[PDB]
Amino acid sequence: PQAFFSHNNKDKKIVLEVLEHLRQSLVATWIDSLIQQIIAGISKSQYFLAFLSNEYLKSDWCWDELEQAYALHQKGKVKIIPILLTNRAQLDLNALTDARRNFLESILTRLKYVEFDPHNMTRSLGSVAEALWQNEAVRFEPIRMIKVNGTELQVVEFKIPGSNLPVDFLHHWDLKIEDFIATSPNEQKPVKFDVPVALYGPGPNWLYAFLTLPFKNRNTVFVFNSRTSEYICVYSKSAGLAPGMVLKG
Amino acid sequence: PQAFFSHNNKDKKIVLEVLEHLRQSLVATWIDSLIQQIIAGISKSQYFLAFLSNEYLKSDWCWDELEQAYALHQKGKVKIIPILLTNRAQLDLNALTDARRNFLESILTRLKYVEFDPHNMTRSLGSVAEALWQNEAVRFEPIRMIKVNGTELQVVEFKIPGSNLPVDFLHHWDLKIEDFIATSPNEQKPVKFDVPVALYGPGPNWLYAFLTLPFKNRNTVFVFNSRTSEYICVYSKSAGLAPGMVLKG
Amino acid sequence: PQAFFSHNNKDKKIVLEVLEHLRQSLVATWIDSLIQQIIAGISKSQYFLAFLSNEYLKSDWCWDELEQAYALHQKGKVKIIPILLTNRAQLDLNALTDARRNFLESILTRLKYVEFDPHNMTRSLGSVAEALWQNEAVRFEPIRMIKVNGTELQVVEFKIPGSNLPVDFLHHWDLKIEDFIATSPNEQKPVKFDVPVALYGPGPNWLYAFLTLPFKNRNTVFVFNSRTSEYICVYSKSAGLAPGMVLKG
Amino acid sequence: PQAFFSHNNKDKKIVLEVLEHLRQSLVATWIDSLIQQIIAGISKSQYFLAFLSNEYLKSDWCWDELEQAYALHQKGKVKIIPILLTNRAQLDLNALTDARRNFLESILTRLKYVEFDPHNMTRSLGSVAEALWQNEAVRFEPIRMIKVNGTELQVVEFKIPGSNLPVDFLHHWDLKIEDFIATSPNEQKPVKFDVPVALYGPGPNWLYAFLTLPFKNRNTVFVFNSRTSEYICVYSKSAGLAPGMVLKG
Amino acid sequence: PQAFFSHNNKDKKIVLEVLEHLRQSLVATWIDSLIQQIIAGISKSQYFLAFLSNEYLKSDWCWDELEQAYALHQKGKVKIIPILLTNRAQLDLNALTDARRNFLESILTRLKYVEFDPHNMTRSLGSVAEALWQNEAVRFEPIRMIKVNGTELQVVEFKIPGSNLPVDFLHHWDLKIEDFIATSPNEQKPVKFDVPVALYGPGPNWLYAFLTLPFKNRNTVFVFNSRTSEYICVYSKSAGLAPGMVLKG
Amino acid sequence: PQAFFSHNNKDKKIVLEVLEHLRQSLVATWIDSLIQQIIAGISKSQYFLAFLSNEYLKSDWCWDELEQAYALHQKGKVKIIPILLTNRAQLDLNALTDARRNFLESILTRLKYVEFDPHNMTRSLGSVAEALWQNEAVRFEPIRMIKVNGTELQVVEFKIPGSNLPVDFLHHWDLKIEDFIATSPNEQKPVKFDVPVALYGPGPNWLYAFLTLPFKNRNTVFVFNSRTSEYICVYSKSAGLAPGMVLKG
Amino acid sequence: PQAFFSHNNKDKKIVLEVLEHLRQSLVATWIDSLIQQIIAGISKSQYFLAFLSNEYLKSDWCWDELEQAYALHQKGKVKIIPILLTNRAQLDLNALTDARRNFLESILTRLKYVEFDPHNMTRSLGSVAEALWQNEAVRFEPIRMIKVNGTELQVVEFKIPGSNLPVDFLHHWDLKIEDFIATSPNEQKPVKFDVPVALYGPGPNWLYAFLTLPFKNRNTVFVFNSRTSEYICVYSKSAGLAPGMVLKG
RNA sequence: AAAA
RNA sequence: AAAA
RNA sequence: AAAA
RNA sequence: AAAA
RNA sequence: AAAA
């Protein structure tokens, strides 16, 4: 799923680490218009991340985007997730005009908002991630760079809400993965360059085949089997790795 | 009230934000002598801001000015507010001569000093302002650049010690306000050019009359009435503003 | 507020004295058409003074002016205050036509009239003034040339019926105090030229701010503080009058 | 309570001194229409005063005013009290028409009247106040200029008929003290300007607080305590009047 | 009443809440010389707050302050209360010299101290209040905000030691309330800005009048009557409320 | 503004003295066609002074000039001010035919006329100027021969009706000073040759600069400042007249 | 004001650019004797710009010039402003003779001097102008060329120290504008030839007048009015403009 | 009239 | 065979 | 009239 | 009329 | 064959 970030200029510091955190969660991002890019791809387009803040509301340029963002939000192409950088109590509602105020208090109630606090980032980041995935198909936890039995790998863990997926789910998905693979060691990407990749999480056989398949000629692939709770190598794109060696988890 | 700033050029990096914050507090400053300018105006001349530091006391010129400043301070013409850039414990007291040392500790104990800390910026500047307003009449908080109900205005805050003021207090005041009004947008002044000016805080009616009058032909003036706790416009020097419109606060 | 005077040339001896007393009461006066001047300004345009007299009812030009005034009075844009030059008993009703008698009786009975007698100037002038402010907001009193502490002053006394005013009340006031200030000693104006002006009577802070603000560069202003019950100087334009003098009252 | 005075110009000498007497009893008095002023305020609007006299009944304009007042008085919105300038025996009933005589005879019997005699001013004035206050709430007394211990005070003495009030009495109490205070020494008001006021009469604590509160910045306030039967200064406005002095009254 | 705080900066963290709790008790607080500030106002000047701590007893600068504080306490100008941050058993009495030691034990026995602890903070806070209010007049329990019947309000609790007060008690009271009313919502003070205030507690009528009177144009005032036990509105400064409503307990 | 005079030779003795008075008011005059001179310059070209006189009604050549002037007035190019040499009652309307008697009554009733009596010469001149400046912008008063402090000075006084001017006013102001100045002492002009001039009357600074500017190398200029109310010399042209002298007018 | 320059020929590179900026601030300079030129004009002769440098102290012909300037400075004809080309710390005081050295340490201490350094042109040039007008009347900021709405324009910005000027201040003023007007584009002058000049900065009307007259037949004049904050044209010396358009800021 |  |  |  |  |  791709995402759009609308935020005020005073908050570069508090945006990218949210921006980056979503990137390691394999969520496509585009920071910098945003309105015409809404009409792109599938009906499951994207979620508007309105980084609501006191100084954000004093920018009319920021306000008009949120106006058009909600204007086509009702028609169903997008749902807006407004993250309050500050607590709802001390949002300065008096400065806005009555039309602006009534428009703000509308969406804040009938549509669920997420509060953000820089002091406790861990629960703050998770709240946005949970809000992002709340109305979604199979989840995607951030990539963990872990070490097992002396070898290094990055694990891609995905959680399936409920138990079953639609049989034709892959037709409507929008998470082609090959653009998340780093091409150079210095390049920052969710998947490190030439680092072994492991898939974790229970799921159907077609889901697993759909994920490792684009990894050919890119990275060694590891698969986790619950029968013995271990990782299994399927692709050997680097020396010292054989297809089928086992790592004890 | 005017203020004279005595300092050495090594601590230049910190003095401007001290006086810049002080200038928004409707406090006149005079950095660049200071001795002969003491004898000017009313017996409520000024306060001597001696920015005491280890390198400050190492300069013979920086010492003699304080000597004369204290010499006529005993006559009561001026009071000195000592600012310690470095905490008193690590002050290089040994480098001074015995006559120099005995003089320095004399003012330090019998006269209250203000401890300064670059890290705790907000509280430290408040303490300096507090000492300035400690022995003064009605206070003057720094100008807050606020916007309320779609219109942007600069507010003026004043706090009165006790409950009452002398009837002839305006006779002995030295705070003419036409020297704090900006003439051009680029040059800095406590009162921004053409920006609506607001008066807040309880006070006598004659105090209000003395303040709004010099703003004629300069800026739109706003007054706060506690009966409805809202703002009232008295002067309309700009388009789109009518005398008597009410701002919700 | 402005006022339109309807009178016959034999009553010219008395209208100007009424006009002057109304002028000294800070009421704008318009003597010399009047019909099209009615539709100008806001809904609180003026109050029509019908100086009813025996000869006034004998003029065809004077009759039709009243009729159109009443025609617009029904609309509520203007109202007519009938001032009786002679007593109602001795009014020449027989000479008038049947329509004129009925029209005169309709306005004299359904709308309260004012009885005027040359013998009692003080009460008659006050009743004329009282009828002007009965349905009006905060009251104005004639300017008084009063000398206190050996210093000459003029007073602008305003009385508030009900001790409460609308918050946006000034938005609907029709009076520019500048036009009442004389630009020359020979000019006839409610406020004399270079004579200090004093404000008296209870009122909100914003009313005091609005009233004395246009006085800048025109006259020195004084206000009343009921806490100590004496006048205080707030403006220094004349020689020897610093801002802050206190004059007992 | 408000009061509307209906009288003939022959009794003009007597009504104002009756009007002035009721004014000192903190009764709002309106002399100068009267019909459309009935529809204003609360159900306890006012008490119509019919100054019945031989000449008064001889005027058609005055007669129809009483007819309208009684006609809507049967609705209970207002009550009329007849004050007889002449005694009932010598009233000119024969001059009245049969409908007028029956109408006057109807009201004079079913509704209680008050007799007025010029020689007995002291008794007659008390009866007028008693009739207004026989069917009314907490009663006041006319203001007395008394001097205790060399201090001038104006006692506002009040009485409670029954020593029991509704707990929400102040909700419908249409008595605003602000309008009864003098803004100038020459102003005719029940409360004189700058003269300290004194509260007398047993009652609930909150009743006092409602009365003294508007006096802030207006007059020095005194309150009577029955524990020592002595007065207490609670406001310090005039010179030398500290809040807390004791007067043996 | 006023209070002066002398302490060491390692105890600066814990002192403020005691001061902040004390401020809520409508008790004037002065933290930051002090020795010359003792001679001010009436003989009931303040109470000295000696926060005795093991760190405190090692400061020569802090010790000598206690000397003149105790010295003029013998004259009866001020009475000192010692607050022991640590329990008396573990005070480092061995560090002090003999002369300093005999000084400290002397003031500990003949003068009542208070025992303090940070675990049982509530009782510890109450004990300090009791010591201050033991020798004082009618008490003042800290302001509490209670939402009764859907309207927010604050209660000013006052309790009278014994049963009565001197008739001239108001003269020497140093508790003018205006020093405790906030002017802005953000700035902290015992009385919140624009919040309705209520007076609850038995007392004489003049005491009630003296309290609500300074609140005009500041906050809405409520008075408690024990006859039926609700709050009675006397002042109406906020929209939606009128003087006369009742708040059932 | 321009002025075109239409009159008969019988009133030539009085026409030029009215023209001279209007010339002294800085009004441009053209005496001796006029019909084709109407279409010249700007829309606010001039005002037709129709000197209505009985003999003028007997000269058909004068009649036809009025006919087109009315016709061109109807489109708004010019406005006619009819001046009555004789009063309305004695006007010879009977000798005029039906078409002409209907012609004049339309102007006399629908358009305001000016009454002129040679006896009240001063009032007549004022009414002529008053009508001329009634529909105009800032007015120009007659220039007086005033001596102050031993200096001969010609003062130019103006008055702003309403004390407000369009900001772009100078673009459409058809008032050039250069043609009102005298080249030789014997030449008749509103401005005397080589006599120093002054500016008086409140107004914007750009208005003052515009009026004095054409005086370079022409006359010595003075200005009036209301701060001290003394004339200020700004031009050093005549001998002994330095720029900067103070003239106590 | 006037200006005399004292410098050494090695520092020719810097002085003329200091002169160039000072000339742009409308100060006439005289670089190339100087001693006899002091007795010329008024008591406010000029400010002696002593460009102190290491080599300047090494020229005997340059030194005695300073002594005569200083010696006559005691008479108050001129005040000397010393500019330090190099810092005071490494000034070659040892090379100078005892009399010469003592003369230098005299002037350097009792009169304020100016430090100048290459690396910062802007502060160095501003500080020179700052001390240039520290003891002088209304300041004249350097001429700046600003094109507004497509119209090229040069602005002369002047600011008044304090709030008021002496009424006869123009008598002693030494800023004859005609000496700063260019006659040809090629030559350099503070005012560009044929380029319109705009007047900016609050001030009295007469001061505004004093500057515009010397511009007639020379350059187009513009005046900034703060009522609406644009520039108003009063003189038309160039085609395409006639006095009166508005240049919105 | 010291929560009337 | 889209870095085999 | 000391945020009426 | 001291940026009206 | 939905971590076989």
Author numbering:
A (entry chain p), B (entry chain Y), C (entry chain Z), D (entry chain B), E (entry chain A), F (entry chain s), ...: 2 to 33, 42 to 258
Pull text from the paper.
Here we investigated a protein containing a CARF domain fused Toll/interleukin-1 receptor (TIR) domain, Cat1. We found that Cat1 provides immunity by cleaving and depleting NAD+ molecules from the infected host, inducing a growth arrest that prevents viral propagation. Cat1 forms dimers that stack upon each other to generate long filaments that are maintained by bound cOA ligands, with stacked TIR domains forming the NAD+ cleavage catalytic sites.
In the cryo-EM 3D classification, we observed two distinct classes, one corresponds to the trigonal filament bundle, described previously, and the other where five trigonal filament bundles join to form a large pentameric assembly. The inter-repeat unit interaction between β1β2- loop on both sides of a dimeric CARF domain of a Cat1 dimer and the TIR domain of the adjacent Cat1 dimer, enables the assembly extension and provides an opportunity to form an even larger filament network. As the filament network spreads, flexibility results in broken densities (marked as “1” in black dashed lines), preventing model building for these segments. The above-mentioned shift of the TIR domain mediates its interaction with the Cat1 dimer of the next turn and results in the generation of a closely packed spiral bundle without pitch and with a large pentagonal pore at the center. In contrast to other CARF effectors, however, the cA4 binding pocket is formed by not one but two CARF dimers, where the bottom CARF-dimer forms the base of the pocket and the top CARF dimer caps the ligand. This result further supports the idea that the linear, trigonal and pentagonal filament bundles of Cat1 are not independent units, but part of the same filament network, and hence cannot be investigated on their own. In addition to the distinctive arrangement of sensor and catalytic domains, the higher-order networks formed by inter-filament association are unique to Cat1.
